[PDB]
Amino acid sequence: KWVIDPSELTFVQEIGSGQFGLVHLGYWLNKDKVAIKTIREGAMSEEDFIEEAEVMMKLSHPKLVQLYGVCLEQAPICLVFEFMEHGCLSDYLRTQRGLFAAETLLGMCLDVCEGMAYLEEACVIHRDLAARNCLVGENQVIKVSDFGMTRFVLDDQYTSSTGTKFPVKWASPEVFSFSRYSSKSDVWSFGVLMWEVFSEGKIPYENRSNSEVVEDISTGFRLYKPRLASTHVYQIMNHCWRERPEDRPAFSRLLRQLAEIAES
Ligand SMILES: COc1ccc2cccc(-n3cc(NC(N)=O)c(C(N)=O)n3)c2c1
Ligand SMILES: COc1ccc2cccc(-n3cc(NC(N)=O)c(C(N)=O)n3)c2c1
């Protein structure tokens, strides 16, 4: 069962501040060390979230951050996750910039691709795959997290394609135009994530506003090759950024292609 009783949790140390509240390091009774995220009331549709717990709890892969359960006795509710000792991938790339071998960056892309190929096979769409949503664990392993979360987010400025805070930088054209989500729109976000990894955590389209990204992408602009990305890696990146979702490789195809490059 996904319901965790407040007596089954102990908060040990404040890790930091998330978007919707606080993140703590804690222990889960008779189980493991955990990361506990406290969610501010009004931030998410708790009822819609709770409804999908039975089905969603079954998703498990070595490259996906495990969400152990939800503490919902009293407001604010808590989300109990697998503890990822090195934090988010975006901050990790940024602080370790200049210390990454090209093979390590490719391996990080491979970890995310494998996690996404599992979600794609399970018919689960992430919707907002980005380095900020990926976590770094034991021995630099990368795990995908927060998949499907934007379906519960109550801030219309983030969820609506015309929203002031819409994550347009990771959006495929059918997503930014019509909110037409698929594993193929996740493939486009994966390409941007590959660019983020190979650029050692640089922000994509830093010099552009939301409508400028939409105009550039619609007119054929694509993110420049990062210095650390080989031409073969950049070709894969461009394949993720094909205008038509049908022309984009599936995650199962990307995984074979990226593994062949890594293993030589
Ligand atoms: C457990 O309750 C839910 C309820 C709704 C969900 C909707 C989308 C995704 C969910 N979700 C998110 C997960 N992990 C994560 N790091 O974000 C998992 C999992 N099985 O590890 N399931 C959900 C998990
Ligand atoms: C939020 O601030 C921090 C600062 C330092 C951290 C050091 C280690 C791990 C962190 N951490 C742990 C997380 N979640 C998890 N499942 O383990 C997250 C996250 N962004 O979801 N960040 C950290 C989070």
Outline the structure in words.
Keywords: Adaptive immunity, ATP-binding, Cytoplasm, Disease variant, Immunity, Kinase, Metal-binding, Nucleotide-binding, Nucleus, Phosphoprotein, SH2 domain, SH3 domain, Transferase, Tyrosine-protein kinase, Ubl conjugation, Zinc, Zinc-finger. This is Tyrosine-protein kinase ITK/TSK. This protein is an alpha+beta fold and 264 residues long. The protein folds into two domains: 1-83, Phosphorylase Kinase, domain 1 (2-Layer Sandwich); 84-264, Transferase(Phosphotransferase) domain 1 (Transferase(Phosphotransferase), domain 1). It has helices at residues 46-51, 53-56, 89-95, 102-121, 156-159, 173-178, 183-198, 210-218, 231-240, 251-262; strands at 9-17, 22-28, 32-39, 67-71, 77-82, 134-136, 142-144. Helix 4 (102-121) packs antiparallel against helix 10 (251-262). The radius of gyration is 18 Å and the shape is globular. It starts with 8 loop residues before the first strand and ends with a helix.
Secondary-structure blueprint of this entry?
Blueprint (H helix, E strand, L loop, with lengths): L8 E9 L4 E7 L3 E8 L6 H6 L1 H4 L10 E5 L5 E6 L6 H7 L6 H20 L12 E3 L5 E3 L11 H4 L13 H6 L4 H16 L11 H9 L12 H10 L10 H12 L2
Antiparallel strand pairs: 1-2, 2-3, 3-5, 4-5, 6-7
Helix pairs in contact: 4-7, 4-10, 7-9
The protein binds the ligand COc1ccc2cccc(-n3cc(NC(N)=O)c(C(N)=O)n3)c2c1 (2 copies).
